[PDB]
Amino acid sequence: HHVGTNTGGVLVITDTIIVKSGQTYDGKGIKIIAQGMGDGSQSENQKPIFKLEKGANLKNVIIGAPGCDGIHCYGDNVVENVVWEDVGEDALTVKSEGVVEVIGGSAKEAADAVFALNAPCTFKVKNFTATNIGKLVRQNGNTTFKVVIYLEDVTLNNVKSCVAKSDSPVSELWYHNLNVNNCKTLFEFPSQSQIHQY
Ligand SMILES: O=C(O)[C@H]1O[C@H](O[C@@H]2[C@H](O)[C@@H](O)[C@@H](O[C@@H]3[C@H](O)[C@H](O)[C@@H](O)O[C@@H]3C(=O)O)O[C@@H]2C(=O)O)[C@H](O)[C@@H](O)[C@H]1O
Ligand SMILES: [Ca+2]
Ligand SMILES: [Ca+2]
Ligand SMILES: [Ca+2]
Ligand SMILES: [Ca+2]
Ligand SMILES: [Ca+2]
């Protein structure tokens, strides 16, 4: 395991980091602490830590408290080995259509949702651990566009609400090697037949 060369450094930011289409932001293990961008509460007016334009990628960062409004993804993004030490309002939001992959990493202490899906998308979560969360995935409430979610090699502890929730009959969730400790209801979708194993 190669700890990254920025391991032990702390980058304190005062504005959202924009990653442009075709770019990969590689933190090399840096921890980021945002200031003046939110308190990580449930208030909806916080700034994202990162804005990933379409086709932008992010890897190898630790996001410290306050988690603010996390990572805004505009589609066709790979988010790799990102650690949310303390999720803010939410950890990552899909803001526009495309494929978004969260691969590796982990999240902790999400008062409400970890992942917010606010546009039609294909959303994959792979090799990921989350503990003390409300929900892992929430399609924006009362929307009926289609998302397809894949949960692959995902381990969840202490889920207060549910693993995933959608109000869309056309959305689907697919899982493979999903382990869930301490959750009363796995999936809150219009019908349970929207949920599949593979
Ligand atoms: O992108 C965002 O941050 C969106 O946050 C809000 O919406 C989410 C969710 O999509 C809503 O259904 C609603 O969720 C319910 C409740 O208010 C709370 O989140 C928790 O008890 O879960 C409920 C549920 O999942 O149905 O509000 C959510 C929230 O984050 O508070 C906004 O309403 C959206 O416009 C986005 O800004
Ligand atoms: Ca919330
Ligand atoms: Ca919200
Ligand atoms: Ca709300
Ligand atoms: Ca949010
Ligand atoms: Ca939190």
List the domain range (segments joined by +) for residue 30: 1-198
140: CA distance to ligand 4 center in Å? 10
Q: Whose CA is nearest to atom 36 of ligand 1?
A: 140
Residues 6+ apart with CB under 8 A from 198: 174, 175, 176
The domain tally of the chain equals 1
Residue 151, judged by CB atoms within 10 A of its CB (0-12, 13-18, 19+), counts as buried
State the resolution, in angstroms: 1.2
Residue 48 backbone zone (phi > 0: left; psi -120 to 50: alpha; other: beta): beta
* Burial of 185 per CB tally in 10 Å (0-12, 13-18, 19+): exposed
d(CA 69, CA 48) in angstroms, rounded, equals 4
R_g of the chain computed on alpha carbons: 16
Centre of ligand 3 from the C-alpha of residue 5, in Å: 34
Task: Indicate if ligand 1 lies below 6 Å from the C-beta of 59.
Answer: no
* Method of structure determination: X-ray
The ligand placed nearest to the CA atom of residue 188 is 1
Closest by Cα among 28, 32, 34 to 11: 32
Give the CATH number of the domain where residue 119 resides. Answer: 2.160.20.10
Give the residue, by CA position, lying nearest to ligand 1 atom 34: 140
